[PDB]
Amino acid sequence: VKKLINSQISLLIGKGLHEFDSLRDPEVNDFRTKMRQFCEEAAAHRQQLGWVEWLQYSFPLQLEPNRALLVNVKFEGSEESFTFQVSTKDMPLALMACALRKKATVFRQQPEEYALQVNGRHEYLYGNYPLCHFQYICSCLHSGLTPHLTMVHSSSILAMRDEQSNLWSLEQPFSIELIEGRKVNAMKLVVQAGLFHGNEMLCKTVSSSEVNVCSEPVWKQRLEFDISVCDLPRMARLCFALYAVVDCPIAWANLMLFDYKDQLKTGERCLYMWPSVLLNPAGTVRGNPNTESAAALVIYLPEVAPVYFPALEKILELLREILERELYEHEKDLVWKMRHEVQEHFPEALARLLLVTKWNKHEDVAQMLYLLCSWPELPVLSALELLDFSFPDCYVGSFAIKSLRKLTDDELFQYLLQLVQVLKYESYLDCELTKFLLGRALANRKIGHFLFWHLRSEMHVPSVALRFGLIMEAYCRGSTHHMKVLMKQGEALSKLKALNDFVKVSSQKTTKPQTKEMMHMCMRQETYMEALSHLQSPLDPSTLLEEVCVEQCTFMDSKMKPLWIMYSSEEAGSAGNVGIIFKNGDDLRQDMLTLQMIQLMDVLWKQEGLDLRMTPYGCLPTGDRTGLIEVVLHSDTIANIQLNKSNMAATAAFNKDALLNWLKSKNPGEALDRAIEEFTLSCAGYCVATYVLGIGDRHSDNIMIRESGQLFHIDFGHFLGNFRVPFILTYDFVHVIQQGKTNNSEKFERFRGYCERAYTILRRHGLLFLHLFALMRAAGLPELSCSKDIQYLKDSLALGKTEEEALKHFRVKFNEALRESW
């Protein structure tokens, strides 16, 4: 059985576990055994949770960031069901009491024994919360729908739980011998090498002497650094770049000077180099796995006597306000001098102090750490800053995780993407961030779900395959059942890929009707009906994808011919009618990021009582240029609606009227006002989000409207100004906001206020976006490469200005956009 599980893990994670063994690598081996044990413990803990606690693990609550309503309720084993009138303010427990009193009378005769499942979803309603605090009840009110719930007894939830079981001494200056190489180029070669702690150089960057492009080159050269060996900080990083000149970059390579056991390295190393875009401190500290093709530098770390980094026990032994809100050498001096007073009275300025400390002076680092040990825990916002690559010190990292542990699961979920990217910055395999993410992922199945996908979607990237592979393994060891659930997802994805490859070939040889029919026959094969049906959605583990409706599946006409897959579920009723789009050929990372930031905006807006009626739909890369999009049904593109076809409801005298005619036909009589309001609010949200994020190439083909009137965006190929984007007001949106009237400053100006509120709220959290994007610089998203991309956010949010000036500035941009409206 152990063999079976091992083989399933290899299939799931996209790397055979034998590849870990073949490395004959102590660190890998220690991570696997340590992490296996940690994960296994978490599962044992889990197998004995109370039933409500188990629910908490498996179906975490979906909550929003008097008035009456109708609800339908039924019990697990029977078809019979009752419709109740309840108040949005009622607890689930009250509703459950009605359900039982109804059962008792019909069936001729304890609420706390039950949870309420949402029909045909992995979603539950429990806790002391009024019904409308639950996302699902709230959603039902806006969409108009009746909530349909099922009474699930504790012995049934427990039956589910059961089925799911498993030193200071050395004053001589640091130096290395550069022996030889083996590589390809056109001219002379030079090796440049610098020592880094994060971004900062610990001293100047020394060079080789020009040697001809010959060989297989040979140097055998001491390179002596302008720094003492005793001063090398724990996280010292030695970086190499090899290039050509008579500037032509060839390759780069980095390593930590101390191994994972705190021991300084000696003697000879062979460094398999990574091909170039000279010095790359933020690049990984593990060699290029393609040893056959990779250029290889061989160096020699000289024996300085085994020597270890001193224990913390040995470390611990060894106008200020006016600036503190980039700083000159003297200003830096006042900060270091007043470090205790910073700890005592400004513990939130920890990062500014950490940047000013001299990381190339062992004494100063001792004192800095000493303060860090007694430092009070910081708010999450501050912790998110300390995870930036500027803070490579693992006591700082340890501190930041410590300050992060107080994240809620919802918060942790909100930032999961960024924390995963920060994994790429880590100097070693076993680290606090890994243990933290794995622990929280095993304590919450939703977190586990997305941690897995964020990792799985990057397995094709050699610089991260080993790390990400090992983490997924560890997870699997901690949840066997969930491993099987994920395989099912991976089997579905694998089928879609073959199906999509067919569609691409077929679409070049035949007419769309014929390709569609052939897609359908292919889908109707047993292997395909089996693989594509009865899974959890990778977009949302609480969405069940039951029976694929082949007849409604199809594909779109865009280059990659993405697949449109429809699903249905008897047990979920209408709500189990859901769509996913499969796309293979495009990078979805950028779209995922943009959608997460828009969803964050919506969370922040709603926290100040502003609901802009946003559509935060799923988008999830799953593999190499592969991922999924959640279909928002009952929507169409502006372009399609503006085709202004005859013989339809929406037929207008003037094209400017098409959009509003369409809304009218989907919203008869009195419902039109609300649709127009829905459209106005969402328009404001998306105009602000696109403006702040620098999303250009917005046009009628990538903007969609729902039948409710809500407006949303698809296909973000470009953000942060990369193809300074103006604020955008389109005439046809303006026409709709103005209820079809030429002049309507009452409606238009309400709209302006929506934008202004939405924008001013985001500025108050500007720092949160800045820290989040800072962390994403680790993703290697092509439009999120350097500082000038972050600057785009500094400028769009005008964080330098007071709220008076920023609102003045925003007002001009807005007015400028209105003038551009014809």
Which tokens belong to 564? 């449109």
258's enclosing H/E stretch is none
Q: Shortest distance, CB of residue 194 to ligand ZZP, whole angstroms? A: 40
Which CB, 288 or 635, lies closer to ligand ZZP?
Answer: 635
Is 783 an interacting residue with respect to ligand ZZP (CB under 6 A)? no
Which CB, 446 or 583, lies closer to ligand ZZP?
Answer: 583
Q: Which stretch binds ligand ZZP (CB under 6 A): 276-284, 432-440, 556-564, 770-778?
A: 556-564
User: What dihedral do alpha carbons 477, 482, 486, 489 form, nearest 10°?
Assistant: 170
Q: Length of the chain, please?
A: 822
Question: Is the bond preceding 216 in cis, omega lying within 30 degrees of 0?
Answer: yes
Is 697 an interacting residue with respect to ligand ZZP (CB under 6 A)? no
Question: CA 315 to CA 368: how far, in whole Å?
Answer: 10
Judged by CB under 6 A, the number of residues near ligand ZZP is 17
Interface positions, 282-301, toward ligand ZZP (CB under 6 A): none
Q: Shortest distance, CB of residue 697 to ligand ZZP, whole angstroms? A: 9
Q: Shortest distance, CB of residue 140 to ligand ZZP, whole angstroms? A: 20
Which CB, 423 or 539, lies closer to ligand ZZP?
Answer: 539
Contact pattern for ligand ZZP over residues 440 through 479, marking x by CB under 6 A: ----------------------------------------
Is 709 an interacting residue with respect to ligand ZZP (CB under 6 A)? no
CA distances from 758 to 91, 142, 240, 677 (A): 32, 21, 47, 16
Q: Is the dihedral of CA 794, 796, 797, 800 positive or negative?
A: positive
If DSSP states are collapsed to H, E and C, what string results for 402-457?
Answer: HHHCCCCHHHHHHHHHHHHHHHCCCCCCCCHHHHHHHHHHHHCHHHHHHHHHHHHC
Interface positions, 143-172, toward ligand ZZP (CB under 6 A): none
Is 562 an interacting residue with respect to ligand ZZP (CB under 6 A)? yes
Is 686 an interacting residue with respect to ligand ZZP (CB under 6 A)? no
Question: CA 659 to CA 663: how far, in whole Å?
Answer: 6
Which CB, 237 or 718, lies closer to ligand ZZP?
Answer: 718
Q: Shortest distance, CB of residue 717 to ligand ZZP, whole angstroms? A: 8
Q: What is the DSSP string of 212-256?
A: ES-SS-EEEEEEEEEEEGGG--TT-EEEEEEEEE--EEEEEEEEE
Question: CA 679 to CA 685: how far, in whole Å?
Answer: 10
Pairing outcome for strands 211-212 and 188-197 = antiparallel
CA distances from 703 to 294, 338, 588, 696, 714 (A): 45, 54, 17, 12, 6
Q: Which stretch binds ligand ZZP (CB under 6 A): 247-255, 430-438, 554-562, 596-604?
A: 554-562
List the one residue from 166, 266, 577, 702 that touches ligand ZZP (CB under 6 A). 702
Interface positions, 582-641, toward ligand ZZP (CB under 6 A): 583, 591, 617, 619, 629-632, 635
Which CB, 552 or 702, lies closer to ligand ZZP?
Answer: 702
Which CB, 583 or 664, lies closer to ligand ZZP?
Answer: 583
Which CB, 201 or 539, lies closer to ligand ZZP?
Answer: 539
Is 546 an interacting residue with respect to ligand ZZP (CB under 6 A)? no
Which CB, 248 or 556, lies closer to ligand ZZP?
Answer: 556
Under 8 Å CB-to-CB from 26, ≥6 apart: which residues? none
Is 581 an interacting residue with respect to ligand ZZP (CB under 6 A)? yes
10 Å Cβ neighbour count for 502? 15
Residue 699 has φ and ψ, to the nearest 5°, of -160, 180
Is 714 an interacting residue with respect to ligand ZZP (CB under 6 A)? yes
Is 701 an interacting residue with respect to ligand ZZP (CB under 6 A)? yes
| Residues binding ligand ZZP (CB under 6 A) | 556, 558, 562, 581, 583, 591, 617, 619, 629-632, 635, 701-702, 714-715
